[model samples]
Target: TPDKCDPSLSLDAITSLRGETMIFKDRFFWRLHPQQVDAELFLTKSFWPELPNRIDAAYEHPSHDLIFIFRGRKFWALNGYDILEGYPKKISELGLPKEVKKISAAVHFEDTGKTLLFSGNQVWRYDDTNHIMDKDYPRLIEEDFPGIGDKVDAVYEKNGYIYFFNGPIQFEYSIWSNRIVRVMPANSILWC
Candidate 1:
């Protein structure tokens, strides 16, 4: 006897973005370069076995491997891929702040390569090479430094300093000098 094919159970996925939103269906809806969708993860047999509650964000390392960050009650990094196996060898345990709910956003630094920076009550750096928290020694530009509050909503690195922002206010600083400068405000002040 031969087995029957079940079309209903078949995984034929087509993905698209409608005004910055993703649309997934059975037929290809959006145009994508071959390189973007050619990976095994999109194949019928490689679809996600189970749906995750949510995937908050993801970052790509300079090495081309991906780091998926999930959010629920806490934050975590999901790892383990066949191609880049060994050395690291397994999935990473969840990486969350001491308070679990303090994490706001995380970004990968292309300049440093494999370095990551996260923001919450304060900004923190995670150096993969040394595998430790890179603290700004002597409390360089800490919370409320230059009178800015502790809640940093986002962080970005450029030129040679880390820029912090909350709502519409922006601050930039050189950690070594402890020099902090207000770049933008709600009114877009130039130098006041």
Candidate 2:
């Protein structure tokens, strides 16, 4: 089974996760580092279980306390653990074309407040300050993020490294150097 699961499941069996991690596929767990191929726990809590079942991509706001969660054609803006009101907005509201149905991955730069939204082979870059999708975006994920695979399943930035997820594998990508530094298993983030 993919890491995701039904929200009806409870976290009573779990004590708690010691560290933070992004939501992915059908699960979210604590990770030692992006370079690691395994995780520390299976995460019985399943933060934000009220949202959709499978999370395609996610990113934390650079300047704000918001965390954007994407699934299928919809997305929600969360204030860390709790979700903000009037959320669960359409992906199209992110300025993606109507045909853009799913987000494969996402990344945000804290220094510049630049956010990247991935949908299949194409990716969109948004300027958070202007609240607008930057020009000439919705570009090919390969051309911009070349070292990684053509498509991404999930992504997040940690200490300048973009943790790229593709199926069961995860790639440690450097945006400034624009190269891949390491590779590991996606499940490793689960402490397996």
Candidate 3:
């Protein structure tokens, strides 16, 4: 059903870094300019033979010049437009549980360089440096961030806040306040 997939209908994943936003759908990825109405194809099956037809989550490391793309239980590490060598590794290699067949959302916290991976109702904290999942993680999202719901469709961090997207709704969580500051329609701000 790749041909039937619609970018606006289901934003599988979205990430922004250094003024550019990457929007992902079933089997397509697009690079978009946030301020202007400019967009171009970034990747497709032709680019990577093993690349999954659908992307489940993506995260741009806040401090490092790297981006991780995920689908099902596999992932790719990219440096800018280039895919790193020896990628498409199993998610278990990253210390995630086998039950995590697909990552729903991901965000790399700028201050700590820690990445949080979301799946179902649980969230796992990953320490990239140590190549391990933080102990006592895979916590229920509601337990840590009360207002946010399960199965996040997209996630990105900006300034000092984290945005969690579920369908057309977006939840803004303030890191300093450790609470949800607002809930609004994602289309209100999404420059899609």
Candidate 4:
């Protein structure tokens, strides 16, 4: 019966560097191994000290051992679930555009070493290494990923395909093609 739990209850999740997916809801976080059928609650408020109870967006750096969690206008950098030094910084302190009070979704591009932060009708390309956002960024999502709408509720990359979620719809984008090749219901994926 537990397996029948509704997926809509999830608040947010991100695939870790080691390939396991970490799902969060309220103050509890669960880890789902790819080879397993069940998810295990692995962490809670005690683990993240001052972190918020709900997460708005999350992203794992492609080339680093770090994960970023976003909530409101603040964010935290975690190195293997441990909070990094000098983190929980405000979005404005990170040089992100002023309008971005909360992030809708995020995805790191391995080839470019750039993380895309989706919010409102725009997306910002951030250079983690330099701690700066690329100039002229915050561009309309439609300009780059054709067919994807202005707002994205969640995003993740797997097997070279970037999945973008807008409500119950999922857009499958092929990195090689630089375009969305398919559109389907978000429920089709085990997690979205």
| Candidate-wise lDDT, in order | 0.37, 0.66, 0.76, 0.74
For residue 70, model 1's alpha carbon misses the true position, in angstroms, by: 5.5
Question: What tens-digit string does per-residue lDDT give for candidate 4 at 70-184?
Answer: 8989999887648888988888876786756888788887777788888878889888767778998878988878787878777888878998887667789997898888987
lDDT of 2 by residue, 87-107 (tens): 888887678888778777777
TM-score of 4: 0.83
The number of the candidate with the highest TM-score is 3
TM-score of each: 0.43, 0.77, 0.84, 0.83
Clashing pairs in 2: 3-26, 4-26, 37-188, 38-188, 38-189, 39-188, 39-189, 39-190, 39-191, 40-191
Candidate achieving higher TM-score, 3 or 4: 3
The Cα RMSD of model 4 versus the native structure comes to 3.0
Model 3 scores a C-alpha lDDT of: 0.76
In model 1, which runs have C-alpha deviations exceeding 4 angstroms?
A: 1-60, 63-98, 107-120, 134-147, 185-192
Q: What lDDT does model 4 reach?
A: 0.74
Cα lDDT tens digits, model 1, 43-86, are 21133323233333234343444443323343333234222333
- The TM-score ranking, best first, is 3, 4, 2, 1
TM-score for model 3?
A: 0.84
Clash number by candidate, in order: 0, 10, 0, 0
